[PDB]
C-alpha cells in the first residue's frame, strides 16, 4: 500500500507562532558568535511577522567592519514557506537586486533549497559565509551609511 | 456520496460531520470518536424529539443534509449507578497517563501510579511526586495489587 509501518516516529508539528517564539528567544539571548543578530521589528506584533536582522562583515573580505541591518518577513506558511529577506544598508553582493535590497532566493542556496530545519539565524549566518566567497570578497562597496530611501 | 450534518453539544460547540444516509447511529458515534475523542459508550444522540438507536440509520429517522443533531454526554443514569461507577474508574486512574493503572505501584507518600509512568518521572533514581511533590526514590516502589484487581473487576463489569 501507500503507507508502511515504521517503528520510530519523532518530530511533532510545531505551530508557526511557537517556532517563531523560539527564534525570538535565541536572538534575545545573544546565542552565537556575535557576528549576527535577529529579532522583531515591532515588539507588539503578536503575529511575529516582521523581523530585523544584523550582519557584521567578515574579516579578510571587502565587507570588514561594515554593520548591515536587514529586514526579514515570515509569512503565514513559515517555516514551511521561506521568508522574504531584504537589506537596510546598501550593499553590493552577487544575488541581490541592486536598487532594492530584496534577495533573489534563487541565487542563495539556503533560500532556494528551503527547508523547515532552517532558522533566521542560519539565513544570516550562511549569508555572511556567502559573503566570504571569492567572487564577492573583492566587490566594490558604496559609501557606508547610505541606504535605500 | 457523503453529506454534511451538524452535531451541537449542550455546551455550545457545534460539530460538522461527513456522513451518509446509510450510516447507522453507531457509525456516527465512531465519527464523533475520531474527531472529538469521545468514546461511543458516552454518547446519546438526539434529533427532532427522538432518541436514536445504534442499529437504525439516519435515513430511518429522516436525517438529511444540513440536519442538526444534539449530542448529549452520558445522558443515561446508571449501569450500576452513573456517577458512582464513574467515581470507581477515577480511583484506579493513573494521574500521569490518565488510563487505568497498569502494574500500579506506590511511592513514599502513598500516591500510586503506573510503574512505567512513575519510572519515567524518576529517571535517575528519584524525583518529586506529581501529586504532592514529596521526594521519592525508585528503589522504594511498592506494588499496589488491590488497585490492579479493582481494574479487572471494573473491566469485567463494563463487558458484563
Amino acid at each position: 500500500g501507500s503507507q508502511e509501518f515504521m517503528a520510530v516516529s519523532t518530530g511533532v508539528k510545531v505551530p508557526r507562532n511557537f517556532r517563531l517564539l523560539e527564534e525570538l528567544e535565541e536572538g534575545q539571548k545573544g546565542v552565537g558568535d556575535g557576528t549576527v543578530s535577529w529579532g522583531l521589528e515591532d515588539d507588539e506584533d503578536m503575529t511575529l511577522t516582521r523581523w530585523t536582522g544584523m550582519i557584521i562583515g567578515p574579516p579578510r573580505t571587502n565587507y570588514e567592519n561594515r554593520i548591515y541591518s536587514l529586514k526579514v518577513e515570515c509569512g503565514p506558511k513559515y517555516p514551511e514557506a521561506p521568508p522574504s529577506v531584504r537589506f537596510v544598508t546598501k550593499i553590493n553582493m552577487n544575488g541581490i537586486n541592486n536598487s532594492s535590497g530584496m534577495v533573489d532566493a534563487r541565487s542563495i542556496p539556503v533560500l532556494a533549497k528551503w527547508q523547515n530545519s532552517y532558522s533566521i539565524k542560519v539565513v544570516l549566518q550562511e549569508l555572511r559565509r556567502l559573503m566570504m566567497s571569492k567572487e564577492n570578497m573583492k566587490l566594490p562597496q558604496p559609501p557606508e551609511g547610505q541606504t535605500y530611501n | 456520496s457523503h453529506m454534511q450534518i451538524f452535531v451541537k453539544t449542550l455546551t455550545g460547540k457545534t460539530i460538522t460531520l461527513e456522513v451518509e444516509p446509510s450510516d447507522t447511529i453507531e457509525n456516527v458515534k465512531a465519527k464523533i470518536q475520531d474527531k472529538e475523542g469521545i468514546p461511543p459508550d458516552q454518547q446519546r444522540l438526539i434529533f427532532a424529539g427522538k432518541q436514536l438507536e445504534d442499529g437504525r440509520t439516519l435515513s430511518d429517522y429522516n436525517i438529511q443534509k444540513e440536519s442538526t443533531l444534539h449530542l448529549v454526554l452520558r445522558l443515561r443514569a446508571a449501569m450500576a449507578s452513573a456517577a458512582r461507577l464513574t467515581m470507581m474508574w477515577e480511583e484506579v486512574t493513573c494521574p500521569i497517563c490518565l488510563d487505568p493503572f497498569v502494574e500500579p505501584v506506590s511511592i513514599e507518600c502513598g500516591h500510586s501510579f503506573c510503574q512505567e509512568c512513575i519510572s519515567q518521572v524518576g529517571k535517575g533514581g528519584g524525583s518529586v511526586c506529581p501529586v504532592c511533590r514529596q521526594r521519592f526514590l525508585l528503589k522504594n516502589l511498592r506494588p499496589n495489587r488491590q488497585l490492579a484487581n479493582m481494574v479487572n473487576n471494573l473491566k469485567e463489569i463494563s463487558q458484563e
Binding site: 503507507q3 515504521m6 516516529s9 519523532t10 518530530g11 511533532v12 508539528k13 510545531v14 505551530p15 507562532n17 511557537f18 517564539l21 525570538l24 522583531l40 515588539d43 507588539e44 503578536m46 511575529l48 | 453539544t9 455546551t11 460547540k13 472529538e36 475523542g37 469521545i38 468514546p39 458516552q42 454526554l73 452520558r74 494521574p95 500521569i96 497517563c97 490518565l98 488510563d99 519515567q120 518521572v121 518529586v128 506529581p130 501529586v131 511533590r133
Partner: protein, 153 residues
C-alpha cells in the same frame, strides 16, 4: 509521516469538550491536535475582572513529561507577562508536574493574574511601575483590561 496521538492528549481533549470549566475555554486547532486556542476570564476581585484574555497553547513532543507552551494573545498589564504575551510561571518550568493538565494550567494562569509578583518579574519595566505605585499599576491594569480585553472576541 503519521503516528498515533498519545491517549492522554485524547483524554484531555475529550474532557475539555465534555466537562468545561466556568470562565475558561480551550479548543484544539483543526490542523494540529497539540495546538489549543484559549480564552480565559479575568479573576474576580482583580483589575482583570470582566476581561476576556486570549491565549494559545501547544503540547510539545515530551508532554506530559514537559510543561505545555502557553502565551497570551491579548495585551495585558502584568509584571510576569511580557509585551508579546510570554509568561514566566514556575509550574511552566522548574515546578512543572506531569499530573497537571491543560485545565489546571489555565486555572493556574488566571491564578497568576490574581497574584502578580513584581519582585521576580518577566517585564522589568512593568514591574518597576508595580513597585513604584501599586495603586496606579492596578488602575492601569484595569484600564488595559477594558481597552484590550473587552469586546475583543
Amino acid at each position: 509521516g503519521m503516528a498515533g496521538l498519545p491517549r492522554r492528549i485524547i483524554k484531555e481533549t475529550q474532557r475539555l469538550l465534555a466537562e468545561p470549566v466556568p470562565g475558561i475555554k480551550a479548543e484544539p486547532d483543526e490542523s494540529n491536535a497539540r495546538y489549543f486556542h484559549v480564552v480565559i476570564a479575568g479573576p474576580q476581585d482583580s483589575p482583570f475582572e470582566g476581561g476576556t484574555f486570549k491565549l494559545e497553547l501547544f503540547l510539545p513532543e515530551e508532554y506530559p513529561m514537559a510543561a505545555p507552551k502557553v502565551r497570551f494573545m491579548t495585551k495585558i498589564y502584568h509584571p510576569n507577562v511580557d509585551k508579546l504575551g510570554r509568561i514566566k510561571l514556575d509550574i511552566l518550568a522548574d515546578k512543572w508536574s506531569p499530573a497537571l493538565q491543560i485545565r489546571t494550567v489555565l486555572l493556574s494562569i488566571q491564578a497568576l493574574l490574581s497574584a502578580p509578583n513584581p519582585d521576580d518579574p518577566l517585564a522589568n519595566d512593568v514591574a518597576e511601575q508595580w513597585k513604584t505605585n501599586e495603586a496606579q499599576a492596578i488602575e492601569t491594569a484595569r484600564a488595559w483590561t477594558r481597552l484590550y480585553a473587552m469586546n475583543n472576541i
